[PDB]
Amino acid sequence: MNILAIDIGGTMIKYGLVSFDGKILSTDKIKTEASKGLNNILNKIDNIFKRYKENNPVGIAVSGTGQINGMIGKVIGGNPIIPNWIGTNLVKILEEKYNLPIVLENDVNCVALGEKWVGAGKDLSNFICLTIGTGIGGGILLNNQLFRGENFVAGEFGHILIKKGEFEQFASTTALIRLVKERTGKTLNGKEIFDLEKKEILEYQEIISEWIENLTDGLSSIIYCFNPANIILGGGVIEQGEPLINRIKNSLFKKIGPQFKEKLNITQAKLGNNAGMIGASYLLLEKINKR
Amino acid sequence: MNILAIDIGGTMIKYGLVSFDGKILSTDKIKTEASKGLNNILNKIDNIFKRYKENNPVGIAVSGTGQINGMIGKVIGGNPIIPNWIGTNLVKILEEKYNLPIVLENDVNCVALGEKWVGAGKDLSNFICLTIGTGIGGGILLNNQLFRGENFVAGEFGHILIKKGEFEQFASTTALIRLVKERTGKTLNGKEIFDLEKKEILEYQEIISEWIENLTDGLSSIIYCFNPANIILGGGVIEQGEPLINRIKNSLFKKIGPQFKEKLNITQAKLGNNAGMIGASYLLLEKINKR
């Protein structure tokens, strides 16, 4: 007894089976080919279903890209990276085709729910969980429930303002890569950039330190709004910490007042790139039972 | 019966009786004299209680200054304007002294609950309420409940960043006055500032327009965090009413995406400077009413 989980990212689709206890049982990967459009993605989903059809999945749980109404499983907006993706009720399409319960939820909410279930939030009822990849987004857990916003787009932290501009444009991993490119002429990986800092090359120390300041600028605005006790950081370059987590703490605590930091902890996501599949599966199980 | 409501500001204390339906029955004012300290505050509360003892109030509901844990009624921080105020467990002290139920809550949470009870939040289960006076603060209502934060200081919106610096420093009424003072040498009250704009004085039109942009910068960050459907603005120059609200709305809608503005209302608080007394009383009634 397992769940067929599908994590549709802008570049990769990761899929496999998740147990009723939130354990990854198997995983695979396939290129999204986002520019080929919705019917491309539905074809890939169909091949995923045949590959697992005889595992008798109780349903299909999908983590998607873009702005999504997760109550009904509809893409309502976001960046137009996949033609005809926006507007799609994937719960509609897949429930009719495969005659199984479906959920569709946006990317960072699934990660947050994954960490809530079996990850860095498993002992928490409240936290803010941010992923730092190509952009910055957040999933908000308040009194044990995901907080989606009145129009399902709460937690789009990447668009808040910091001193330099949009949060995302200066504190995502993409922004870090861009800062290195602007100053050194080199187009590097997040790992490659931090390896160079590990060799104490001054140029990369100054850029990463500047990027950390951009990052804790935006975090402090979030903390003044929410006064959380727990922030969970994930994605990409968070692969780096605990040493990264500590620098982020030190930088942040200089920018927020005593009542905002005295009970505040910042910790690393535990589930890595599986959080999305796990969180989507958590949502599917809520939908199936109770009720 | 009735509720004895006390609104402690940094300069004045406003107090009187509030009905069980949220109606102001009487008000008085007396100087806070903040520098005289906690024992001074307790004396004023005592004289306030003696004046109304013979109406047999069901309890004392206090809107306080500073950072406050409203669940237990203790001052936990803020700017140290009243010696020994911070650390004071006012509910413990007053329930023992007067043997009536007491509540103590921070300023903008009381305003929010006031607007929730009988003001602009009368029919809403979710909203964000900002006061725009000497600083900027907010009370957050989510699923019919005040959202205080894990350490009781959620909603300190004045400290989030905008491109120019701290929100409060460029978008409070104090900031507007300071902007007029820096550009013209004159110290005006805000009515005087907007009166000069109605006279199409170019200098004051340009300053107010710049101040409005500062304000919607900060609001846009709040909207990206919370994706509310209802924002209630009160305090200071919001006295100007609908002509100002509409300009704020137009300025703001240029800065947030369709899913954030499609269902969003900017509305004016209805209760003015009586909201605090009314909301503190709402809180006391919540404490009193159980089976």
Author numbering:
A (entry chain B), B (entry chain A): 1 to 291
From the primary publication:
N-acetylmannosamine kinase (FnNanK) belongs to the repressor, open reading frame, kinase (ROK) superfamily of proteins.
In this paper, we present the crystal structure of apo FnNanK. The monomer structure has an elongated shape and is composed of two α/β domains that are connected by two hinge loops (residues 119–125 and 269–271). The conserved residues in hMNK (Asn516, Asp517, Arg477, Glu566, His569 and Glu588) that are required for the coordination of ManNAc are superimposable with Asn106, Asp107, Gln67, Glu156, His159 and Glu168 in FnNanK. Although FnNanK retains most of the consensus motifs unique to the ROK family, the lack of a zinc-binding site with sequence xCGxxGCx(E/D) is evident both in the sequence and structure alignments. However, FnNanK retains the highly conserved His159.
